[PDB]
């Protein structure tokens, strides 16, 4: 059993000294290797990739001046006037505003927005919580002004919801504002961390696509016009702008490159439906107390919400990933073998010689694939009990009968023809008749009727001379000296006496005839002797007082 | 060397015309292919998958009315009264509040919360910064009211921290509020971008699981009751609700489907410990100046923080991914070969014939696997110096002796028995004695004692007639004419004279005996001639004035 | 065709009973299996991994006392005084502040910051929107104080932008503040969800690296000092701290482990350039009305923004992933075959015997690889029309001539020498002359001149006796009886009469000579008979009234 452990199985191979096959094999191997390497390096499949974790710190610089109205009001807007305390992944810059000062919780006519005019008390319902007007209707219709009327609502009054944003936008100068974005990114699995601002960067820089791609100071107007967006128009109703920071980071020492790439993308739909809150704005309430009453100043602030979208992956060499990829791609190196073996398989077919080659003379010298096929493959059939082989001296090939003999004589069964092997020339270089019979020497079988059809076989398919009449038949089969020599070869001390040697000689004669007429031991083992030859052999070496068993399934 | 480059190696194969083996092979191949294809299409393993980057814009609509108290106060709450300016991935809706107006930074008794009652000055420490009371203790105990006492703290007074949230929740009507969620998602690697609102969507829609799964307008109460949550109860102490937007996006043109799926999940633990801040609330300070003093109004706002969780992947066909997957799965197509080869290997074993087949007659016709095994495999042993083969005319097989001859005669060494090859019938179809000896013709070896055991071998294991006595021995071995014919065959012009031809004849006789009794040249090359036969051969073709070398390791 | 479907191809193999090869094979298989299993379990390659979606709820506890100034002001700071309403992935804690109360929109001298002193009106431009001073310059120079001057700007006055943060930080006590972080994480694909606080956790716990790694209550000072950061120093100008919550979650039931790991990392660059806004701060405006004027209190709040970075993956067993990994690694099990086959290939080379073995006697017994190579591989050359084989009785090997015969006699073409196969001993164990000629029996070819060089071949390369003179030549080639026996063997009933049998005998003699002198039918099929032997054969079996075709390309 240890010897069994100590075994190695190696495949038998046929080395072909073919220029075309070698060329094809090497070309296919080179192609597979080149593609595998290109995929490995282009996609960095040898690298474990980890998503980043990002922190964003934004600082907006800029000052705006507004002059509006009934008295003229001159206002200055600094960061605390147009920015919220948040300075993370999103920062808001106010670009326009509607101000409703001195609101009190009381009854008032709703602002006439979106054709909300009232003509009669039936145009509104009492106690209806209108989120559009942002009040609760009292059910009555009251005059908003001299010309139009609007229902009364309990809300923050004077109610002005629905009024249009100023145009032009009051804080247009925000296009000239700048934002400094500090982005700290980390790959914890790879234990790496960097930031978008490194020592040596000039502080007077402003971002540009080509001149200053790494400058993290962005002018808002430049952001808008880089992607063909009009800051002046968006400033009226507001919008959402995304600043994308892509980190395609290679953390390998020999190829270390972890630098941010900045892009811009409008995130709010320019063509948003009017009822779906187009643009970007929010209502902020400044609460105070005046005249012993709780009052509220409502600022509808329109502006651009800048969303900093930080994304990317960090790739670092990982042996497991490379091993997995190489293992996945290893099977592709069998492409050359598959292709060349398929070529040999298909071109060895006889169909190519009869039809393709005469039509196409260029594909003619590819007939060598038959020699390759025969030096590569050994066909064998299942040695089933019904397997029989018959050879007729008239015919030049052997016939296989794999079907059950249902009474019909073996002579009448057609079967499938198979080629006759070439008896090694090297070894051969040395010095009333039954109705089915056609030679006149066959005799009825002595077997039981149920299996008598097996022995109902003649040496030929058409009438003619019996094969037994040939002197070579006597030399190979009936020659007692030759059979005795063969027996001695196998059994040097065999006793050439007794009824036993005669049975041994009979079996040796059967084997000799089968090998001579079938060549291969595969066919000879399942060959069926003709009745004439079988009975002549038995006459030469008969059985004293027994009945012949006949062919035996060797399996 | 170029010829070497121009080589192709093809495996030698044995084609078996077996119905069962072909059936098994094709069934296994179909199963492997079906599973590989199913995995490829189900998991989209041909697609490169990229995580999305999302931007969320939320707009809350809704109006609430509150009537509380000592004077009756009728208050209206619109978006600016219950929402914060943030409208991104999270939005907060106030559902309840505790108001402490007119706070001044001074000394006051802490609110009696969680059994914080005071009975003596020793129940509290001076200068202790109590974050629960949100003040610094003065070390003294003072009467909070007529019945209970509480220590004095320097804080915003009147201190009311620890008071219970109103019940029912004041802003219960928030269940009727609606939120419009605009979700812009982008796959930058795939250069794709879409949003959850497309042209044609009805604006009066409200989200529903089945009727309106794509409507991005959600009623908060509907959100809560979709997952079996009670908005009325959560509104008292607040909570956190997550609106999950899953983007399972297929970006292939032939299978393009990038649509959001909305789900809801409570994010705050319903059973949070009382000391771990159950629910959701925050304290907001409204600062003002009254009576020449800095005053503060503290609003403890309880509400639902809605967290919009946007996640998903975009898959687009990538040739590299498909190639990698196919390469990974290619090796599985060898399953049929592995299984059928294992069947042939195991069923060819003799163990199955002796035990399994007699017990199980159904597994009997599988004995054909032995023929397959012998047509597929050629066993060979290592040709080591100790390798020897011995054949005894008494025994029917050959014996291998691979162990060193440590003085013990080769006759006495047992070794391991091996089968005798069938001499090709096709080629064969033509026309005082030593103590270890058992034939009476062996003679002591003339070799040095150290290696004399090699030649101490007899033609038989038991007493009997010598193999040399057989006439076939003389015909094959001693026949000078046959050996001369063989020599001429190899060397046509060999000069049949001189002491050289005699040595050539002796070696040819050795080879002839070895081939006759061992058949294979593998065994004959390492076979050991019996002393009797060896010395008879030497007598026929002796050496004039030299000592015989004897067997030579051929390796 | 169905029989074709019912076929199975199995590779022919040579089983080697070698201890070293078996050892190498099993060692390599064990190594490959061990590494594959280690990679599978270490990297959980059998698991589908899904990124988490996280929700963070933060609650800060802590109270601070400040005493500053011209009148002494004693202020208390609770959560509503130093925290913003946001309680999600980021929370801000105020640690220092600069307060500018009672600002009015009017003209004032800018604060003298960063050497902004003015000496003349030419040092500033009118209408210049200075974002540093946060005002619009009027173009005039005015005295900020008695000693220094600064230009006039329309801004919120008194302008104090650029004033240094207080030192020490006013809210130093914030180091003693605590934050409770509730983290709800979910894997939607795996349909799993958990949180960082589970029942049974003690509420008096405070986080520690070793003692309380799972306590989600963190002291800010402890956070800073865990990573060697000084909270007192950072509190002056502020900063950004990241609380990383890593979820390495295994969702398999047998290996379920989904627990958070807390780490800390400073996110703001300690060495940020002075002009790049070092630290963290924001300007918040408190608007009010005083004396009938809109006034503003500007608080420059410096503090630590704590960013909770939640990341991780959830791994759950997936059959497809395991199948893909196993398929990727299957090809690696062919390493043993590749290595051992390469060893056999290289050590069988003759180059190793001539040079390596004499120099290195240790690598000598590896000569057995030649026997393995010959039992494993069968070399065959392409049977092209130019393929010819010639054997000279003088030389001991055969010669291959694969080049076109451009008039030059085949005798003069060198070609490449090839070894002579061993004629199976088993089958052989039985009983004026042309200028190019060197035997005296060759005759000029009768073929057309263009192809006459093919037959211009002699039996030897040097002068000597003709091979035809040997009696074995007559026995094998000229023996009519032997050729007739061979013909009968193939055709038992062949009629031994007529001009046909003579041509059959001539062809059989050609084959017999080719097989005798070339052994293999591969070489014999393309062998070229010497002119002497060819013409002697023709003399024995001549053609009556025709011209001999001569050698025919068998392909
Ligand atoms: N191949 C082959 N073998 C045969 C044939 N007939 C008989 N045998 C073999 O010869 C043996 C029977 O010998 P036979 O003379 O017919 O009957 P016996 O006297 O009882 O031995 C069996 O083991 C068969 O394998 C035949 O036609 N073809
Ligand atoms: N297989 C085999 N070969 C042998 C045996 N004895 C001798 N030889 C071969 O014969 C050669 C020696 O011939 P031998 O007559 O014994 O001595 P010599 O006169 O010096 O040549 C060696 O090369 C051996 O390979 C044997 O028992 N078995
Ligand atoms: N291998 C080999 N075959 C030959 C040679 N010469 C002739 N033949 C074969 O013999 C056949 C021609 O016979 P030949 O006596 O030369 O002329 P024929 O009388 O017209 O048949 C062809 O089919 C050749 O394949 C030779 O030198 N070598
Ligand atoms: Cl959106 C925003 C961002 C930052 C600050 C403010 C602030 N809040 N109260 N008054 N605001 C200032 C202000 C004045 C005049 C017109 N518009 C806005 C807002 Cl409203
Ligand atoms: Cl949480 C929140 C969201 C939005 C606005 C407010 C606002 N802030 N100052 N007063 N608030 C209004 C208000 C009045 C009465 C009771 N509760 C709250 C808060 Cl507090
Ligand atoms: Cl950053 C921040 C966080 C929370 C609250 C506040 C609040 N806003 N108006 N006054 N503030 C309080 C206050 C008083 C005195 C000194 N500093 C700050 C701020 Cl400013
Ligand atoms: C931005 O600045 C430039 C130059 O300072 C000025 O011409 C332009 O009008 C400014 N934009 C706005 C919207 O005021
Ligand atoms: C990660 O990198 C830092 C800096 O190089 C190093 O100090 C640390 O040991 C590394 N490994 C960790 C943090 O596990
Ligand atoms: C941008 O929008 C403004 C409206 O505010 C308009 O006057 C201007 O012409 C627009 N610019 C372009 C380039 O369309
Ligand atoms: C929500 O609206 C319905 C119908 O308008 C009303 O019956 C219900 O009371 C409202 N819910 C609350 C909490 O007020
Ligand atoms: C991405 O898509 C847009 C729109 O189809 C196209 O204009 C652009 O060229 C594409 N490639 C990019 C942005 O690299
Ligand atoms: C929801 O909670 C409220 C308490 O505010 C309670 O009155 C009501 O019955 C609850 N509803 C359900 C269905 O449990
Ligand atoms: C934090 O608390 C400890 C003990 O209560 C105290 O000694 C220390 O001074 C405090 N830190 C600050 C900055 O006040
Ligand atoms: C997910 O898990 C929950 C809880 O175990 C279960 O009720 C549900 O059916 C699962 N599948 C889903 C939500 O698709
Ligand atoms: C931390 O910084 C403060 C300055 O506010 C300094 O006094 C103290 O010595 C520093 N601590 C250490 C350990 O460096
Ligand atoms: Na593979
Ligand atoms: Zn007959
Ligand atoms: Zn017959
Ligand atoms: Zn003996
Ligand atoms: Zn003997
Ligand atoms: Zn000659
Ligand atoms: Zn000659």
Numbering used by the authors:
A (entry chain A), B (entry chain C), C (entry chain B): 6 to 74, 81 to 442, 472 to 595
Copy text from the publication:
Here, we report high-resolution cryo–electron microscopy structures of the homomeric rat P2X7 receptor bound to five previously known small-molecule allosteric antagonists and a sixth antagonist that we identify.
The structure of A438079-bound rP2X7 reveals the noncompetitive nature of this ligand, in contrast to previous data. (A) Shallow binder A438079 occupies a shallow position in the classical allosteric ligand-binding site. Each ligand is located far from the other two symmetry-related molecules, preventing inter-ligand interactions. The halogen atoms in A438079, A839977, and GSK1482160 all point toward A312. Following a 40-s exposure to an IC100 of antagonist, channel activity recovered more with exposure to AZD9056 and A438079 (82 ± 5% and 81 ± 5% of baseline current, respectively) when compared with exposure to A839977 and GSK1482160 (67 ± 6% and 69 ± 4% of baseline current, respectively). While A438079, AZD9056, and GSK1482160 demonstrated progressively less recovery after longer IC100 exposure times, none of these antagonists completely prevented channel recovery.
